[PDB]
């Protein structure tokens, strides 16, 4: 029972219809890129990837629409004709057109996005805001990352980053939109690094290539969840951002979220003020900061991840509940953390480690 496609036209429009044959399909399931004379749509079908890749017979405008009929898993993509005129055929298929391939065997597709804004979050961490081109449809699911790609003398260089929400606070958060064109990143700049000093030199209005998403976090791990624990070190906070927003808005069974956020100094606590205000205005969230190397006087917890620390933080409740623990940070932090979580009697299906 394999997916397929068709197309039709009106005086001014060209519609491509993709028949996935799947329940569960939504706007995170398809990525569309197109130019004036070519068109590419990749659709997530279970563990496989269905590609339409066509050079269009006549030119189209940049703005287009995407619509999902979830009952039957039908996706319709409506392009706008430049000139209102009848097409003889859709176009010439291009590389890998109408192919169905396991995602494990697929490669990274990129398009160019524009740097819109950059704001300092800590002394070495910025919030970057990139805008997708009008001719792209791309949503990044919770828990997944994309690759950014930049040119340097003789080659291009690539690193992965985890998109975040623009804010944790409702007064600044983007509303739920039919199509976010803006992607946010929290990125730490390493003076001795290869990629991030170059990213930090990019001017407002220049362009960065962005891949399609990657990562296996299944958001179904949040069905009926009641107690969420987040373990983050440094920039390992970034996958927690969207998870935290989701925990507080789309899990009506959620009793508690608790974040334990490990950093070196007070100056390194990304979004400290936002986290503190969020926790105060919402008793479901608890936030604790652990500093491994404080500068100033610190009447708070100190150290690195330990067996003592998670014994108290994950102390067993009196009542049984559906539980999830997410951990992200430096490899040592995550390796030591998951070892400790198995020693505390948490199952594999109760732990996700981003790595
Ligand atoms: C799935 C995924 C998601 C990520 N998401 C984000 C994100 O949202 N935000 C973010 O800021 N970063 C994220 N990272 C880290 C990020 O991808 C880059 O590794 C980071 O930006 C550094 O790249 P760089 O070229 O600037 O520095 P690099 O040149 O790679 O190194 C910078 C410095 O770090 C130290 N260092 C480098 N490699 C090692 C090593 N193997 N062992 C010990 N020390 C080392 C060295 O001092 C080096 O000078 C993510 C990584 C992964 C794998
Ligand atoms: N999806 C992902 O896999 C993903 C996403 C985001 C960030 N990351 C990774 O998270 C890491 C964050 O690096 P950073 O510069 O922000 O951290 P950092 O250097 O600021 O250190 C932050 C905290 O990490 C902990 N830590 C550091 N070294 C440790 C060790 N040897 N043992 C135990 N704990 C230790 C300490 O408590 C420290 O306070 C990066 O390596 C990045 O690649 C991964």
From Swiss-Prot:
Cofactor(s), names only, from the UniProt record: FAD
Residue spans crossing the bilayer: none
Keywords assigned by UniProt, alphabetized: Acetylation, Endoplasmic reticulum, FAD, Flavoprotein, Heme, Iron, Metal-binding, NAD, Oxidoreductase
Compartment annotation: Endoplasmic reticulum
Documented EC number(s): 1.6.2.2
Binding sites annotated in the UniProt record for FAD: 200-215, 227-259
Source organism, top-level taxon: Eukaryota
Domain called CS: residue spans: 1-91
GO BP of this protein: bicarbonate transport; cell development; detection of oxygen; glucose homeostasis; insulin secretion; reactive oxygen species metabolic process; response to antibiotic; superoxide metabolic process
A GO term from the CC aspect: perinuclear region of cytoplasm
Residue span(s) of domain FAD-binding FR-type: 108-220
Enzyme's top EC category: oxidoreductase
Molecular function terms, GO-annotated: cytochrome-b5 reductase activity, acting on NAD(P)H; heme binding; metal ion binding; NAD(P)H oxidase H2O2-forming activity; oxidoreductase activity, acting on NAD(P)H, heme protein as acceptor
Tissue specificity statement from the Swiss-Prot or TrEMBL entry: Widely expressed.
Assigned protein family: Belongs to the flavoprotein pyridine nucleotide cytochrome reductase family.
Role: NADH-cytochrome b5 reductase involved in endoplasmic reticulum stress response pathway. Plays a critical role in protecting pancreatic beta-cells against oxidant stress, possibly by protecting the cell from excess buildup of reactive oxygen species (ROS). Reduces a variety of substrates in vitro, such as cytochrome c, feericyanide and methemoglobin.
Protein name: Cytochrome b5 reductase 4
Provenance organism: Homo sapiens (Human)
Lineage: Eukaryota, Metazoa, Chordata, Craniata, Vertebrata
Gene this protein is translated from: CYB5R4
Portion of the parent chain present: 166 to 520 of 521
């Amino acid at each position: 029972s394999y997916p397929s496609y068709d197309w039709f036209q009106t005086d001014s429009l060209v519609t491509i219809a993709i028949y996935t044959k799947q329940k569960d399909i939504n706007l995170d399931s398809i990525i569309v890129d197109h130019q004036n004379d070519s068109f590419r749509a990749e659709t997530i079908i279970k563990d496989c990837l269905y590609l339409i890749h066509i050079g269009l017979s006549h030119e189209v405008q940049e703005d287009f629409s995407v619509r999902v009929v979830e009952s039957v898993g039908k996706i319709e993509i409506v392009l706008q004709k430049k000139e209102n005129t009848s097409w003889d055929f859709l176009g010439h298929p291009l590389k890998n057109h109408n192919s169905l391939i396991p995602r494990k065997d697929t490669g990274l597709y990129y398009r160019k996005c524009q740097l819109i804004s950059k704001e300092d979050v800590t002394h070495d961490t910025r919030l970057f805001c990139l805008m997708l081109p009008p001719s792209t449809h791309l949503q990044v699911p919770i828990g997944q990352h994309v690759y950014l790609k930049l040119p340097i003398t003789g080659t291009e260089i690539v690193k992965p980053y985890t998109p975040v929400s623009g804010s944790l606070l409702s007064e600044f958060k983007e509303p739920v939109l039919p199509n976010n064109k803006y992607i946010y990143f929290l990125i730490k700049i390493y003076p001795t690094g290869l990629f991030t000093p170059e990213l930090d030199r990019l001017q407002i209005g220049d362009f960065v290539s962005v891949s399609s998403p990657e990562g296996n976090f299944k958001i179904s791990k949040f069905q009926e969840l009641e107690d969420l624990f987040l373990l983050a070190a440094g920039t390992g906070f970034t996958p927690m951002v969207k998870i935290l927003n989701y925990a507080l808005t789309d899990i009506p069974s959620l009793r508690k979220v608790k974040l334990m956020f490990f950093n070196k100094t007070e100056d390194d606590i990304i979004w400290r003020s936002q986290l503190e205000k969020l926790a105060f205005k919402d008793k479901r969230l608890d936030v604790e900061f652990v500093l491994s190397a404080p500068i100033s006087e610190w009447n708070g917890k100190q150290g690195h991840i330990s067996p003592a620390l998670l014994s108290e933080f994950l102390k067993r409740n009196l009542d049984k509940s559906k539980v999830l623990v997410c951990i992200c940070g430096p490899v040592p932090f995550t390796e030591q953390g998951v070892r400790l979580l198995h020693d505390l009697n948490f199952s594999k299906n109760e732990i996700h480690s981003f790595t």
